[PDB]
Amino acid sequence: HEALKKLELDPTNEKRRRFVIRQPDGTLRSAKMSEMRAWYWKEEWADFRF
Amino acid sequence: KVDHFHANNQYQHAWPLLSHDDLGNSDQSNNTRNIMYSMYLPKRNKGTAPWFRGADTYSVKYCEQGRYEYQRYLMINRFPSEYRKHFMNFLSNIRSSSGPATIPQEALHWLLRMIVDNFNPQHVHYIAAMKTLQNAGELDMARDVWKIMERQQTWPCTSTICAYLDVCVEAGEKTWAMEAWNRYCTELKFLQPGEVDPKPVSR
Amino acid sequence: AKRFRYNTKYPSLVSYNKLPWEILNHETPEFHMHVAPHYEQIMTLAASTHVPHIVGKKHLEMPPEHRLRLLPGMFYMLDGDSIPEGFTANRVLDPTALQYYGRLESLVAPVQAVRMLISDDLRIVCNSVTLQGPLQLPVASYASLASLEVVTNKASASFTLFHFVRPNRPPSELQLEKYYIHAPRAMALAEFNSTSNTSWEPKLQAPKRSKRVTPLPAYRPPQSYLMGLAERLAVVPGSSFGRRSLMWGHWF
Amino acid sequence: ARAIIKRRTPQLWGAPGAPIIRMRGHHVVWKFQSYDLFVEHTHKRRNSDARLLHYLGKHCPHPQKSLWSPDTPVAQDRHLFMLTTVDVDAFKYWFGVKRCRLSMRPWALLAKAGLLPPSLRQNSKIMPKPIFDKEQLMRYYLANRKEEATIEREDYLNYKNSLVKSEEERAAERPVAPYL
Amino acid sequence: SRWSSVWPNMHYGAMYLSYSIGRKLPMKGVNWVTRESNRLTNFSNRYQAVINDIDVKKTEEELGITLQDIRWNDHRRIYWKCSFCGSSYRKSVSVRTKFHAGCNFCKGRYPSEVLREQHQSLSLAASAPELIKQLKETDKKDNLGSLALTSKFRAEWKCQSCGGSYRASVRSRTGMVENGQCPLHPNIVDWSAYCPSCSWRPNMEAIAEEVQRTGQFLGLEAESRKIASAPPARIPRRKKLV
Amino acid sequence: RRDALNGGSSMTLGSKGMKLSPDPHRRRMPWTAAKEYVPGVVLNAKEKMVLDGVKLVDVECVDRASQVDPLEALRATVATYEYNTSTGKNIFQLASQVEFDGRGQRFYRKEWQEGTYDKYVTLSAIDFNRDGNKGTAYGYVTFHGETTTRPVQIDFADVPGWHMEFRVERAVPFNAIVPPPPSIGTDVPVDPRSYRLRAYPFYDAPNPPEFVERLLKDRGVIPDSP
Amino acid sequence: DIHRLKPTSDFKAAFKDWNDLMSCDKRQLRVRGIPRMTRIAIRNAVHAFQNGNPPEYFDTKE
Amino acid sequence: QHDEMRQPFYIHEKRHGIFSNEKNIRKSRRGLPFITPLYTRHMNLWET
Amino acid sequence: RQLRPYYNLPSKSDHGRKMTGFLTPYRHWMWKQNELWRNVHEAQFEHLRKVYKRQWLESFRVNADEYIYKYNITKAAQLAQWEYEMQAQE
Amino acid sequence: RDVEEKRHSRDVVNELPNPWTDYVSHALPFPDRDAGYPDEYGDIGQWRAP
Amino acid sequence: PWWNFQTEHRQRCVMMYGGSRAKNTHNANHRVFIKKYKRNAFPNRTRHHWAVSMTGVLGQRPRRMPWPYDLTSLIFNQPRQGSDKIGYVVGTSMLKTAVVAANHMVYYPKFNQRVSRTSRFFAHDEDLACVEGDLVHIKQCRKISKYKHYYVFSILEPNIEGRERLKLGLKAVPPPLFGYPVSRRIVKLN
Amino acid sequence: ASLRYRRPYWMLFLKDVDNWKIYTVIQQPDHQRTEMLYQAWLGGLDRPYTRPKCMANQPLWLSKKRHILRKDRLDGPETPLEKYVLEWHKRFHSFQGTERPTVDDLHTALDLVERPLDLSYAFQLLNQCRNVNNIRFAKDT
Amino acid sequence: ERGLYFPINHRIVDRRIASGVTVEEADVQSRYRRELRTSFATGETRQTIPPAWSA
RNA sequence: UAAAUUAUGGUCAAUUGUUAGUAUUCAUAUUAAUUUUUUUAAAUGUUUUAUCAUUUUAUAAAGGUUUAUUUUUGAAAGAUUUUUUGUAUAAAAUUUUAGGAAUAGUUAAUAAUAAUUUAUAAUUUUGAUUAGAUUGUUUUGUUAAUGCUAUUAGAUGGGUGUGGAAAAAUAAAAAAAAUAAUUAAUAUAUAUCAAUAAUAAAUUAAAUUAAUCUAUUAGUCAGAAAUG
Ligand SMILES: [Zn+2]
Ligand SMILES: [Zn+2]
């Protein structure tokens, strides 16, 4: 739930979102941050301030 | 919803951008920065700016919430006979949920799920649920049934105090029982010779 | 597959899908099919303990108005065969009925004769099974058949069982089950107290066996065209007894 | 159980069938073909809803690239990715607790997930199916034996309750002097 | 019929299919014509191995296009022959001069597309001449004797059973893989040492040998070999939670 | 339901079997329980090719018009009998011959001695219909030692697949009720020399090596070339 | 060749050798004029064999 | 067809007891035009 | 399906079925190596169908416990407010 | 099962949690927090806050 | 997709990033009315038909709609809508049976306004107490006949005038002076 | 492959009758006189009759009436065995009998032989006691 | 021919009869429209009930 | 009947027509269409079973409906050593047509009643019954927007009353009781009513597997552009 991406991408949250990448050698591993962020609707950020 | 021509639920959550072949705009080698803004990021109407449902376009009070606080006391009333139905059902299902396969904890689960259902577990739903975990020797569970009865701030009737007290017997902890004594089964007085034995139901 | 709750479907003034009412009929071998394996447990009973109404001294004497008021369900064993009053007797030699009494006779004194008696009222039928000879049971001194003077007397004791009922009646009002009290054989223990106590030496351990088991004859797999995997087929290991996951001994 | 059966579309038994974790997906042009993974019953009406239980996810049969991560010098990461979104916890409740039938293409996926063991029909054609014999099977169990006192535990805490209220830290629930 | 219209799939190399009216028109009207500064052969100094890998006869005969008629950036779809391996394709001088795009088989002579030269994965001749004898004769073995053991090069070889031509990866043959790729089967040696149909036999030999030795076939024998041979010394075990 | 295989499993649909329940599966379909069926089609396939050149006589071939040479009617008797013994003998053709209707004699269909199967039917009664070869055949069943405790009706008597090795000891007349066989654990104690049990409730015989080398050959562990 | 609608017998010619039966794909078969229900069934049985099932199953046209 | 412009599913559970749409899934004439009226709402709205 | 081996027992009959289900004892033995490598398989597949009742319940336990610990603070606080507004109304 | 468990315990890389198999993170039916949904007025989850 | 522009469309199969998949039905079609009768020959009597109908329900327009927020939901909490209904019991002449006439809520979104509406119900009353007019509470149950799914769950005010009117003997309520509206000039003289 | 649905219930478990679809439709008034004629055709009766509401297998009673009124052939009984053969084909060949022949009633028929004709007759009664009624001949047959 | 088909006057389901019993085992035919009759149709005036001794 | 801010807090509302004295949602525009273009479909033989039988496999033909369509474990999921239970038909809100009026196996109570039981019965102008169009309540189009204007396909009686549920006389593209098979999504020219292609419509080329297609009309007084 994109409203709560900063929650569901925080290790301290036990209800964290779960992503797994099974490499092509069968080894399971857990996501990269970039892939985690891929699964939400596109996040724009540009601080015009300075 | 699903597998009709117009699938909705697969777009209902967020899938990254599939660039596997020319789905029309040479999606697979053409990388499509501006094509996404103008074209595939949905819009507020034809031509309006790209609406971004992003995870940074939601208000920062959304992350700072504790759990289940959005949930308000829901006082749900159900017909009388419908009360009876669902009562006998969560009773039957604390006694036995699945036929032969249950873990002991299915009463406990069914007591809670009675709670989460915004239901009022009667004392019979407590007696039952305490017997069925005593039988199974899940006494820490027959205790947490006490604690559920207590977090409910409920008044264990004589039957229920006897029940939990058996549990203290079997687990062998005097403390566990001393508080039930201190709390509830103190104003219990033996039947003095003059007074009526089974004082009638009153309310 | 379990049992549903209520008939919500049909007008109950016309009984529709109801499994029909079993009626044991005295004419046909079904009567004895049901009342036959029951007698053997009342025999093991009256050979273990004393139960009152079994070992009478004679018939019951009651007017034909009250005959059906006490008898129906009366079952007792007399010293010898003798038709009670107000009855006629019909011997039976049908082998398809007699066949059942095999388990009766191979556990107690073998059965000599079998009759069906009908009252002159036509409405009280007494299956009367007369037994013969030395019993196979170690009848206990404090039995009822022990007071029947049969095990006291030597061989050639012809005692006889009677079971009265009304006819055309289901196997429910055949009050022959209420004596299914199971009492064991203590005569078996009676060895270790009398003069065999110094004669018998018991061994508590096992002896040193240096020899493994001699194997069965080598297995020749079947050669007929088999039904198939008796697991997948829902057929109990011998179509007789066992567990469908304990599929021992069906061809393999 | 029907007078004139529906011919291409009979299942085994009954009108509302057992729940099954199917992985459907509409047949249009391959480029536009991705799979609606979802719990549902066997015997449906013509569409995928009337015995739809619980949308379970979506699969992309088309292996996509690392255009969400940078260009690593790491092979297994540069390989195409095949992506799917499950409903892990309602799958556990349906499959595990309500016992819905796990069809073979969906299983082919979740096997790759790591939830379920790799299926029956991921047949390594290149190795034969096994040869069972009681002599060797019992001779092994003879050789290596595990105990009742190590097996009953795992049986319990693997099919029955497993939150061991640590006997020591059940002390935190046995009150102190004001009520002890 | 109908499915004639379906576009041919495009992968992660294929750029613009040019499969509709406006998809070709604005590129159709580019009436190219070869001038002396267009002429590829004027540019041998820079593009010597682009000159030396042209199937010239295959081109002219089939196309009506001459080695002289070739631009250095000619968009015409001509045929070439790899001067490293020796396979034939139909590739335009444009996507071969702009991008260094070539033979679909010499695409993988280098072990991993990503890190192509860094591989110190050893060569073929200086490492394993027992492949140098089974590889198909090319007269380019003088150069292929440097292909890495880890190369995905779909190299063609002589089999030993059917004598014929079987094409397999140099790595899928040799067995060893550069540290950190997708590794290949434990038995890929024994299941590509032969022909795609005659690689069956050298396998079930040791498989039935154990059905005989043990009266029972269970793939777990390699496992149990590894436990009866390789004791773990100190493999850290996690503090239990129960 | 009551006893499905390995419990209730669902990695397939076939993991239960071609029926999940030794019980019926409806209370309105009593017959659909699981009995040990023995082929009805192929073991009611009476070879008509034994009965071709015989010039049969029908029960309306009673006319003098149709009466045949008694030598050819003898051809007809030998033909009809060889015609019924084509697959085998029904029990009602087995134990019409043996004295006392074979009561007490332990029958067995052919499989009931082959494999781990070890069973007989210490038959207890036989009753014949007007047409013989049909009727009600009751018998104290005996599996791997243990008998029923009452005479049950015997299934697939009226199919031709039977045998019996009449031993004179079991000749039980029409006057004495069949004394039921003893079971080897209960009614008679066990001896390790007179009877030894073929297979127990756990037992499964080692692999027939002809079957192991057929399966190897087919599944391509044993090379199989023409 | 079991099904009266999967007559795999009719096209023993389209394949030259055993390997060109075991290595033609389900689209390589539409290359070879083999109609729909035929080539799917060919592919079924071919992959059954590939594993170790020989097509030893009964013929029900009749 | 977006959900943010919709009141979520779990509110029919919070109204009619958790997992009580399933007993209507398993119904007979479920799907032809009508279904069991699914009471997803804001909770701050119930007439009840 | 239930396979129709060409070495089944062909019911030599024109009315029902030219091939019946009646194995040659090779089949009832081959069918063995068939239906035990599936029960080697669906031993883990039904070992899980429980483990995901040890996992989905030993999680609904914790989470309904926590949902009630929070909906109880909420239930109790809204109940208190109803009592208070009852006072101010009086 | 036994020989596979022997080799699995022999595998060092194992004995790590695969959070897809180990727990059902939120088994109840409803989220732990209001997630961008509408409000009494329809103020869709973006036009509001909790 | 919908948010895309006609010529910027490519592929009507999928939706690439997100949005609403839906079939752009063709509302713009000039539905018509084929006159199959004559302005003086119609096989109806009351409501003649002479132009296209707008069809639907929860679709007609003015868009009336269900609204539970009425008197009933202000007074009673309910398990399911319509359970509890308060009205002037009107009509009880069917022995042991009451007709309770109580209102619901019909909200008009376009206008931003309401009108609650009338309905003569059936309501069982074992023992025949209520008289026409007692403001009563009525609750739902299991059905009681073809048409009564309700029962008189209380009285909120008994028409004491009426009860005494019966006790004295007269009709607890005089009957309406005139009938239903007719079309014939009924000439009552003397 | 169950005909449970296509035909009415009581016709569950009807085999070896041909084309039962006529009794399904036997109530419809045209088929009614159609079978009024088929029953009169089969005869044995006098007044109109059809097989009752839900019967396809003709009544056991009517089948016995026709099976006993069908005149037994051999109107020329002369020798002992022709009389005995009429009696035997009334005993063990009247409809639905429960008695099965006796070797002692084969003996009498077998001992009424004068001619090769009676040789054939008692020989066929041997045929039947051998193969139709499944009996055991005496020791001395 | 002059009313509903399965009237609710006779629509009754008694639950002091065990489960399944009316399904497939046994018929319980009775007259339930007198045990389901109301105090307004009989006359039961619920008098104060005295207990044992005072009775 | 008080100002206040610890400074944009809680996430985009915004209307683009050349008219013709004036009053008035009303020709010409743009958006969504339809008219319009073959890149989504498609085949026959359901399948087991012990056998002339039986186990398994239940809402697309119409049928004309606006006080309308509603229901369960007993089938199955489904796990044990046996007899094992109380959860279902009900509803509730919304119902069209210019000129508007009477309708009827009837209403309630008794009832496991009354083809002739009792009665001051019931539907209706809060718009009934007849007849007419019409598939019924998260799918669109336009609009900044209350609106206006859309969404399919599915339930058309009972008659031996089988089944868990009549929904049952042919019209998947669900693997359908042994792992068949997925190296597969491809489907030949066959169809339904869905499904918007003119996909860089004109100079620099397609790190392809070289596959389909040769590509066009408008106006020319107002108002871009005219004469013979
Ligand atoms: Zn090359
Ligand atoms: Zn080779």
> Residue type for F182, please?
P
I1, I35, I3: which is closest to I19 by C-alpha?
Answer: I3
Please give the distance, rounded to the nearest whole angstrom, from the Cα atom of residue E203 to the centre of ligand 2: 14
Contact of K58 with chain H, judged by CB distance below 8 Å, is answered with no
Q: In degrees, to the nearest 5, what angle opens at C-alpha D19 toward C-alphas D14 and D23?
A: 115
- The answer for residues whose C-beta is within 8 angstroms of residue C209's C-beta and 6 or more apart is none
Q: Is any Cβ of chain D less than 8 angstroms from the Cβ of H32?
A: yes
Helices (H), G1-62: 19-22, 26-31, 36-51
| Coil, strand or helix at K67 | strand
Query: What is the rounded distance in angstroms from the CA atom of residue B24 to the CA atom of residue B6?
Result: 19
**Beta-carbon separation of G56 and I6 below 8 A:** yes
* 3-class secondary structure, F82: helix
Q: State how far the Cα of L133 lies from the Cα of L89, in Å rounded to an integer.
A: 13
CB distance from B18 to chain I under 8 Å?
no
Is residue D57 left, alpha or beta, with left meaning phi > 0 and alpha meaning psi from -120 to 50? left
SS3 at position F148: coil
Identity of residue G40: I
D102/D108 Cα distance (integer angstroms) = 10
Q: Which residue has the tokens 């002289």?
A: E68
CA distance K65 to K114: 9
Q: Which residues contact E97 (CB under 8 A, 6 or more apart)?
A: E47, E50, E72, E73
Rounded CA separation D98/F77 (Å): 66
> DSSP string spanning C75-118?
EEEESS--PPTTEEEEE---HHHHGGGHHHHTTSSPEEEEEEEE
- For B165, the enclosing helix (H) or strand (E) is helix B158-171
Cα–Cα dist F53/F68, whole Å: 13
Q: What is the DSSP string of B21-82?
A: S-SSS-TTTS--HHHIIIIIS-BSSTTSPBP---SSSS-TTTTT--TTTT---------HHH
Tell me which H or E stretch contains K151.
strand K150-152
Give the CA-trace dihedral at B7, B13, B19, B25, to 10 degrees: 60
* Residues after which a C–N gap over 2.5 Å breaks chain M: none
Q: How many CB atoms lie within 10 A of CB K186?
A: 7
* Method in brief: cryo-EM
Q: How many residues are listed for chain K in this entry? A: 190
Report the distance separating Cα B140 and Cα G35, nearest Å: 68
The Cα E166–Cα E158 span in angstroms is 7
Q: Which two tokens stand for residue G6?
A: 């999967």
Query: Half-sphere exposure of residue B106, counting CA atoms within 13 Å on the CB side?
Result: 19
Two structure tokens written together for E129:
């001449």
Ligand 1 center from residue E12 Cα (angstroms): 20
Q: How far is the CA of L131 from the CAs of F62, F64, L101, in angstroms?
A: 16, 21, 11
The CA distance from B191 to K27, in Å, is 82
| Residue F90 φ/ψ, nearest 5 degrees | -50, 160
Place of tokens 């074209």: B39
| Among chain H residues 4-43, those with CB within 7 Å of any atom of strand N | 6, 23-24, 26-30, 32-34, 36-38, 40
Task: Name the protein residue, with chain letter, whose CA is nearest the C1' of N136.
Answer: K57
H or E stretch covering B149: helix B139-151
Residue with tokens 């499964």: F204
CA distance K164 to K158: 11
The tokens 């006691």 sit on which residue? Answer: L129
Rounded-to-10 torsion of CA I66, I68, I70, I72: -150
Instruction: State residue B151 phi and psi, 5-degree precision.
Output: -45, -30
Phi then psi for D158, rounded to 5 degrees?
Answer: -120, -20
114-153 of chain K touching strand N, CB 7 A cut-off? 117-120, 122, 124, 126, 140, 142-149
Angle, nearest 10°, between helix axes B106-116 and B123-135? 160
Q: Distance between CA M8 and CA L131 in Å, rounded?
A: 65
Q: Sign of the CA dihedral H29, H34, H38, H39? A: negative
Cβ contact, residue pair A39, D114, below 8 Å: no
Q: How far apart are CA M40 and CA E224, in angstroms?
A: 86
Q: In the 3-class helix/strand/coil scheme, how is E207-224 assigned residue by residue?
A: HHHHHHHHCCECCCHHHH
Phi, psi of I57 (to 5 degrees): -95, -45
| Interface with chain E: mutation pick from D80, D125, D133, D157, highest number of E CBs within 10 Å | D133
- Local structure of residue D97 (DSSP, 8 states): I
Residues of E in contact with B21 (CB under 8 A): 9-11
| Distance between CA atoms of residues F186 and G3, nearest Å | 56
Nearest to D33 by CA among B94, F4, B18, F107: B18
Cβ-defined contact of A39 to B63 (cutoff 8 Å): no
The tokens for F109 are 């269909």
- The answer to whether C99 touches C32, Cβ cutoff 8 Å, is no
Coil, helix or strand at residue F17: coil
Residue G22 tokens, joined: 């075991």
Cβ(M40)–Cβ(K128) below 8 Å: yes
Selected residues 4-23 of chain J with any CB under 8 Å from a CB in chain D: 18, 20-21
Q: Does D46 touch chain B (CB under 8 A)?
A: no
E210 φ/ψ sector (left φ>0, alpha ψ -120 to 50, else beta)? alpha
Structural contact between residues F151 and C102, judged by C-beta atoms closer than 8 angstroms? yes
Phi then psi dihedrals of residue G37, to 5 deg? -60, -30
H-helix or E-strand spanning residue B141:
helix B139-151
Tokens of I16: 């029902």
Residue I36, number of CB atoms within 10 A of its CB: 14
Structure's resolution in angstroms: 3.5
* D interface with H, Cβ–Cβ below 8 Å: 15-16, 41, 45, 47, 49-53
* E106 annotated as ligand-binding: no
Q: Does J12 touch chain I (CB under 8 A)?
A: no
Q: How far apart are CA I27 and CA D134, in angstroms?
A: 18
> In whole angstroms, how far apart are CA J33 and each of A15, H3, H39, I64, I70?
11, 16, 20, 14, 11
Measured in angstroms, the CA of L87 and the nearest CA of chain F are apart by 13
**CA separation for the pair G8, C209 (Å, rounded):** 66
Which tokens go with L24? 């399904």
Q: Which of L62, L112, L60, L109 is nearest to L89 (CA)?
A: L109
- Distance in angstroms (rounded) separating the CA atoms of residues L127 and F57: 9
Rounded to whole angstroms, how far apart are CA atoms B198 and G35?
88
Residue B52 near residue B41, CB atoms below 8 Å: yes
Pairwise CA distance, residues E235 & E213, whole Å: 33
According to DSSP, the residues that pair with C113 across neighbouring strands are C130
Look at residue F100 and give its three-state secondary structure.
helix
Nucleic strand N within 7 A of Cβ G32: no
- To 5 degrees, how large is the angle CA I20–CA I22–CA I23? 130
Spatial contact of L53 and L32, defined as CB atoms under 8 Å apart: no
Which residues, in sequence order, are CB contacts of F49 under 8 Å at separation 6+? none
CB contact under 8 A, M13 and C6: yes
Q: How many residues does chain B have?
A: 203
Q: How far apart are CA E93 and CA E78, in angstroms?
A: 8
Task: Give the closest residue to N102 (Cα–C1′).
Answer: K182
User: Can the peptide bond before residue K62 be classed as cis, meaning omega within 30 degrees of 0?
Assistant: yes
Of the candidates C62, C183, E182, D70, the one whose C-alpha atom is nearest the C-alpha of residue A35 is D70
User: Do residues K63 and K109 lie in contact, with contact meaning Cβ atoms separated by under 8 Å?
Assistant: yes
Q: How far is CA F134 from CA C66, E176, F90, F103, F164, in A?
A: 47, 76, 9, 16, 18
Give chain E as a 3 state SS string.
CCCCCCCCCCCCCCCCCCCCHHHHHHHHCCCCCCCCCCEHHHHCCCCHHHHCCECHHHHHHHHCCCCCCCECCCCCCCEEECCCCCCEEECCHHHHHCCCCCCCCCCCCCCCCCCCCCCCCCCCCCCCHHHHCCECCCCCHHHHCCCCCCCCCEEEEECCCCCCEEEEEHHHHHCCCCCCCCCCCCCHHHHHCCCCCCCCHHHHHHHHHHHHHHCCECCCHHHHHHHHHCCCCCCCCCCCCC
The position carrying tokens 């046909």 is C28
Can you say whether the dihedral through the CA atoms of L1, L7, L11, L16 is positive or negative?
A: negative
**In whole angstroms, what is the distance from residue E147 CA to residue E121 CA?**
9
Q: Token pair 């049986």 is at which residue? A: D155
Tell me the angle at which helices B106-116 and I57-89 cross, rounded to the nearest 10 degrees. Answer: 30
Question: Which residues in chain D have their CB less than 8 angstroms from residue K9's CB?
Answer: none
Question: Phi, psi (5° rounding) for residue D141?
Answer: -50, -45
Q: Which residues of G touch F219 (CB under 8 A)?
A: 52
